[PDB]
Structure formats: structure tokens, C-alpha cells
Write a protein that holds these residues in place. Structure first.
Motif, PDB file in Angstrom:
ATOM      1  N   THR A  28       0.817  -1.209   0.000  1.00  0.00           N
ATOM      2  CA  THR A  28       0.000   0.000   0.000  1.00  0.00           C
ATOM      3  C   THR A  28       0.853   1.262   0.000  1.00  0.00           C
ATOM      4  OG1 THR A  28      -1.724  -1.195   1.192  1.00  0.00           O
ATOM      5  CG2 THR A  28      -1.850   1.201   1.154  1.00  0.00           C
ATOM      6  N   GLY A  29       1.912   1.289   0.807  1.00  0.00           N
ATOM      7  CA  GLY A  29       2.800   2.440   0.788  1.00  0.00           C
ATOM      8  C   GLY A  29       3.594   2.592  -0.494  1.00  0.00           C
ATOM      9  N   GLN A  30       3.965   1.477  -1.116  1.00  0.00           N
ATOM     10  CA  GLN A  30       4.505   1.524  -2.473  1.00  0.00           C
ATOM     11  C   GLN A  30       3.505   2.122  -3.449  1.00  0.00           C
ATOM     12  OE1 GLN A  30       7.554   0.934  -2.962  1.00  0.00           O
ATOM     13  NE2 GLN A  30       8.304  -0.706  -1.628  1.00  0.00           N
ATOM     14  N   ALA A  31       2.270   1.625  -3.436  1.00  0.00           N
ATOM     15  CA  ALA A  31       1.269   2.101  -4.382  1.00  0.00           C
ATOM     16  C   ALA A  31       1.053   3.598  -4.232  1.00  0.00           C
ATOM     17  CB  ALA A  31      -0.041   1.345  -4.179  1.00  0.00           C
ATOM     18  N   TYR A  32       0.798   4.053  -3.006  1.00  0.00           N
ATOM     19  CA  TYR A  32       0.619   5.482  -2.785  1.00  0.00           C
ATOM     20  C   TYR A  32       1.844   6.275  -3.209  1.00  0.00           C
ATOM     21  CZ  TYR A  32       0.295   9.925  -0.380  1.00  0.00           C
ATOM     22  OH  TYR A  32       0.290  11.266  -0.090  1.00  0.00           O
ATOM     23  N   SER A  33       3.038   5.717  -3.038  1.00  0.00           N
ATOM     24  CA  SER A  33       4.247   6.432  -3.412  1.00  0.00           C
ATOM     25  C   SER A  33       4.533   6.400  -4.905  1.00  0.00           C
ATOM     26  CB  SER A  33       5.447   5.867  -2.660  1.00  0.00           C
ATOM     27  OG  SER A  33       6.564   6.724  -2.797  1.00  0.00           O
ATOM     28  N   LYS A  34       3.875   5.532  -5.665  1.00  0.00           N
ATOM     29  CA  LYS A  34       4.267   5.296  -7.048  1.00  0.00           C
ATOM     30  C   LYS A  34       3.144   5.383  -8.069  1.00  0.00           C
ATOM     31  CE  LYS A  34       8.718   4.297  -7.244  1.00  0.00           C
ATOM     32  NZ  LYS A  34       9.277   4.704  -5.925  1.00  0.00           N
ATOM     33  N   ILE A  35       1.886   5.196  -7.689  1.00  0.00           N
ATOM     34  CA  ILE A  35       0.785   5.151  -8.643  1.00  0.00           C
ATOM     35  C   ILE A  35       0.015   6.459  -8.557  1.00  0.00           C
ATOM     36  CG2 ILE A  35      -1.205   3.894  -9.455  1.00  0.00           C
ATOM     37  CD1 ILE A  35       1.480   2.492  -9.678  1.00  0.00           C
ATOM     38  N   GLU A  36      -0.113   7.122  -9.704  1.00  0.00           N
ATOM     39  CA  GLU A  36      -0.553   8.510  -9.747  1.00  0.00           C
ATOM     40  C   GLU A  36      -1.987   8.690  -9.263  1.00  0.00           C
ATOM     41  OE1 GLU A  36      -2.964   9.793 -11.874  1.00  0.00           O
ATOM     42  OE2 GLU A  36      -2.700  11.808 -11.052  1.00  0.00           O
ATOM     43  N   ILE A  37      -2.927   7.929  -9.824  1.00  0.00           N
ATOM     44  CA  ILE A  37      -4.347   8.155  -9.557  1.00  0.00           C
ATOM     45  C   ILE A  37      -4.707   7.935  -8.095  1.00  0.00           C
ATOM     46  CG2 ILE A  37      -4.769   5.813 -10.346  1.00  0.00           C
ATOM     47  CD1 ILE A  37      -7.172   8.812 -10.494  1.00  0.00           C
ATOM     48  N   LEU A  38      -4.014   7.019  -7.426  1.00  0.00           N
ATOM     49  CA  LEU A  38      -4.177   6.876  -5.985  1.00  0.00           C
ATOM     50  C   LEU A  38      -3.667   8.105  -5.254  1.00  0.00           C
ATOM     51  CD1 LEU A  38      -4.897   5.133  -3.576  1.00  0.00           C
ATOM     52  CD2 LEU A  38      -2.654   4.096  -3.736  1.00  0.00           C
ATOM     53  N   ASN A  39      -2.490   8.586  -5.635  1.00  0.00           N
ATOM     54  CA  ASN A  39      -1.903   9.729  -4.955  1.00  0.00           C
ATOM     55  C   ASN A  39      -2.789  10.956  -5.093  1.00  0.00           C
ATOM     56  OD1 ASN A  39      -0.044  12.273  -4.930  1.00  0.00           O
ATOM     57  ND2 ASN A  39       1.060  10.672  -3.818  1.00  0.00           N
ATOM     58  N   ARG A  40      -3.248  11.230  -6.310  1.00  0.00           N
ATOM     59  CA  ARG A  40      -4.101  12.389  -6.536  1.00  0.00           C
ATOM     60  C   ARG A  40      -5.415  12.284  -5.775  1.00  0.00           C
ATOM     61  NH1 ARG A  40      -4.635  17.618  -6.794  1.00  0.00           N
ATOM     62  NH2 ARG A  40      -6.552  18.193  -7.904  1.00  0.00           N
ATOM     63  N   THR A  41      -6.121  11.157  -5.882  1.00  0.00           N
ATOM     64  CA  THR A  41      -7.433  11.100  -5.242  1.00  0.00           C
ATOM     65  C   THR A  41      -7.331  11.150  -3.721  1.00  0.00           C
ATOM     66  OG1 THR A  41      -7.395   8.694  -5.389  1.00  0.00           O
ATOM     67  CG2 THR A  41      -8.472   9.899  -7.163  1.00  0.00           C
ATOM     68  N   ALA A  42      -6.344  10.460  -3.149  1.00  0.00           N
ATOM     69  CA  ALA A  42      -6.119  10.569  -1.715  1.00  0.00           C
ATOM     70  C   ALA A  42      -5.744  11.981  -1.293  1.00  0.00           C
ATOM     71  CB  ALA A  42      -5.039   9.582  -1.287  1.00  0.00           C
ATOM     72  N   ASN A  43      -4.855  12.641  -2.033  1.00  0.00           N
ATOM     73  CA  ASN A  43      -4.510  14.002  -1.657  1.00  0.00           C
ATOM     74  C   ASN A  43      -5.705  14.935  -1.771  1.00  0.00           C
ATOM     75  OD1 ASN A  43      -1.766  13.818  -0.889  1.00  0.00           O
ATOM     76  ND2 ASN A  43      -1.184  13.600  -3.043  1.00  0.00           N
ATOM     77  N   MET A  44      -6.557  14.738  -2.777  1.00  0.00           N
ATOM     78  CA  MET A  44      -7.753  15.565  -2.886  1.00  0.00           C
ATOM     79  C   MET A  44      -8.662  15.400  -1.682  1.00  0.00           C
ATOM     80  SD  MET A  44      -9.055  15.903  -6.775  1.00  0.00           S
ATOM     81  CE  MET A  44      -9.668  14.230  -6.886  1.00  0.00           C
ATOM     82  N   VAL A  45      -8.862  14.163  -1.235  1.00  0.00           N
ATOM     83  CA  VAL A  45      -9.732  13.942  -0.082  1.00  0.00           C
ATOM     84  C   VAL A  45      -9.130  14.533   1.187  1.00  0.00           C
ATOM     85  CG1 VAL A  45     -10.858  12.233   1.325  1.00  0.00           C
ATOM     86  CG2 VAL A  45     -10.764  11.922  -1.111  1.00  0.00           C
ATOM     87  N   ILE A  46      -7.880  14.194   1.486  1.00  0.00           N
ATOM     88  CA  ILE A  46      -7.239  14.717   2.691  1.00  0.00           C
ATOM     89  C   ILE A  46      -7.224  16.242   2.696  1.00  0.00           C
ATOM     90  CG2 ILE A  46      -5.054  14.888   3.892  1.00  0.00           C
ATOM     91  CD1 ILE A  46      -4.675  11.885   2.809  1.00  0.00           C
ATOM     92  N   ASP A  47      -6.697  16.846   1.630  1.00  0.00           N
ATOM     93  CA  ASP A  47      -6.582  18.296   1.565  1.00  0.00           C
ATOM     94  C   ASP A  47      -7.935  18.988   1.574  1.00  0.00           C
ATOM     95  OD1 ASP A  47      -3.961  17.621   1.377  1.00  0.00           O
ATOM     96  OD2 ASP A  47      -3.599  18.530  -0.583  1.00  0.00           O
ATOM     97  N   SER A  48      -8.987  18.324   1.099  1.00  0.00           N
ATOM     98  CA  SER A  48     -10.295  18.958   1.152  1.00  0.00           C
ATOM     99  C   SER A  48     -10.899  18.871   2.543  1.00  0.00           C
ATOM    100  CB  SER A  48     -11.222  18.316   0.126  1.00  0.00           C
ATOM    101  OG  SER A  48     -10.712  18.490  -1.181  1.00  0.00           O
TER     102      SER A  48
END
Lengths: 92, 101
Positions: A25-45
Motif C-alpha cells: 500500500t505504501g509503495q502504491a501510494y508512493s508510485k501510482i498517480e491516480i491513488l496519490n491524486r485522489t487521496a490528496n484531494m480527499v485529505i486536503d479537502s
């Protein structure tokens, strides 16, 4: 209280984790774009919602007797002497 | 390749090369006029086909996907990369400003 509790207690006496695969999971979040963007959108919102403190119910509780101005300052302004509000919210 | 000609005989190499250059310059419409070809002494024309073609390199959607990924990682709407209509453009600026920045 609740007579069944002694039985319910034995159905799950201690919590267990559910986030198996923590490394991948930490690899995926660190490496796969669409996960990183959608998670950052939720957290930052979510982090930028203000909290309003209302009226006080008369019932007793744990965190007894805290004056409203303090609770407001802790929630909205400064959770503790060392960490900001935004970092605290994003961590939570 | 434009044409393939074939024989079982053996041919004088220097004259064969000259003949190739004559055919090449004569038959192309830009260079030359002639178009009918008469073969004698048993030179055979061999039918052939393009064994691998540029048509099968239809990359176009895959690279478009990668562009979208890059564009998405920063979080800028495609309307800002294109420019669209007014109803598209004016709200999209507010989207970009408020959500990302």
C-alpha cells in the motif's frame, strides 16, 4: 447494564488490524498517480473545514468543565504547543 | 521496395546495376514518362506484400492516456490545456484555483 456483554466480549475480545499489505500500500501510494491524486484531494479537502462549537448539554462526561473558549481555541487554532492545526487534522 | 524481378540465370553485375538505375529513374512519374514494362528471356516478376506495416502502430490512445496521467498528477483540468467554450472556461479557472492551489 447489558447481560449479554459477557458473551459479546468473547466474540471479539481484542481488536485486530484490517490494513493488511501495508508495505505494498505504501509503495502504491508512493508510485501510482491516480491513488496519490485522489487521496490528496480527499485529505486536503477535509482538512480545511472549520468547526463550530455550539451549546452545552447538561449531561456529565469525561472531559468535564472545559470552558468553551479553550475548546474553540484547541479545535480551530492550536491543538497543542508543538504541532499546528492543519498537520494535526491531516494526520488524523 | 517498388518491384522484384527474378531469374535462374546469372547476370553481369555491372550491367544489372545499370539496368536497375534505368528502371528506377524511368518509371517514377516525377522523373520519367515510361510505364509499360516488357520482360524477355525469362525474367519473372515476383508478387510480394508489405510484411509489416505502419498501420499497426496505432499508439494514439495509449500516449493520450499517459498525457492524462501527467496532467492529472498536478490536477489541472484539460480545458485549461485546450481552451473550450465560455461556459467551460470561466468555471474551470475557479476549479483549478480553489481545489489545487
Amino acid at each position: 447494564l447489558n447481560p449479554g456483554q459477557r458473551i459479546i466480549r468473547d466474540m471479539e475480545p481484542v481488536s485486530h488490524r484490517t490494513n493488511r499489505k501495508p508495505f505494498t500500500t505504501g509503495q502504491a501510494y508512493s508510485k501510482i498517480e491516480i491513488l496519490n491524486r485522489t487521496a490528496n484531494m480527499v485529505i486536503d479537502s477535509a482538512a480545511e473545514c472549520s468547526y463550530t462549537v455550539g451549546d452545552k448539554y447538561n449531561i456529565v462526561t469525561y472531559a468535564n468543565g472545559v470552558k468553551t473558549k479553550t475548546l474553540d481555541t484547541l479545535l480551530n487554532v492550536r491543538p497543542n504547543p508543538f504541532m499546528d492545526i492543519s498537520t494535526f487534522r491531516r494526520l488524523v | 521496395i517498388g518491384l522484384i524481378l527474378e531469374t535462374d540465370e546469372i547476370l553481369n553485375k555491372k550491367l544489372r546495376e545499370r539496368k536497375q538505375e534505368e528502371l528506377q529513374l524511368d518509371y517514377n512519374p516525377s522523373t520519367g514518362q515510361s510505364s509499360v514494362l516488357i520482360l524477355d528471356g525469362g525474367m519473372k516478376a515476383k508478387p510480394y506484400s508489405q510484411i509489416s506495416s505502419f498501420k499497426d502502430l496505432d499508439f494514439k490512445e495509449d500516449i493520450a492516456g499517459f498525457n492524462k496521467s501527467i496532467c492529472l498528477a498536478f490536477g489541472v483540468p484539460q480545458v485549461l490545456i485546450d481552451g473550450g467554450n465560455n461556459a467551460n472556461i470561466r468555471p474551470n479557472i475557479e476549479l483549478f484555483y480553489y481545489m489545487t492551489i
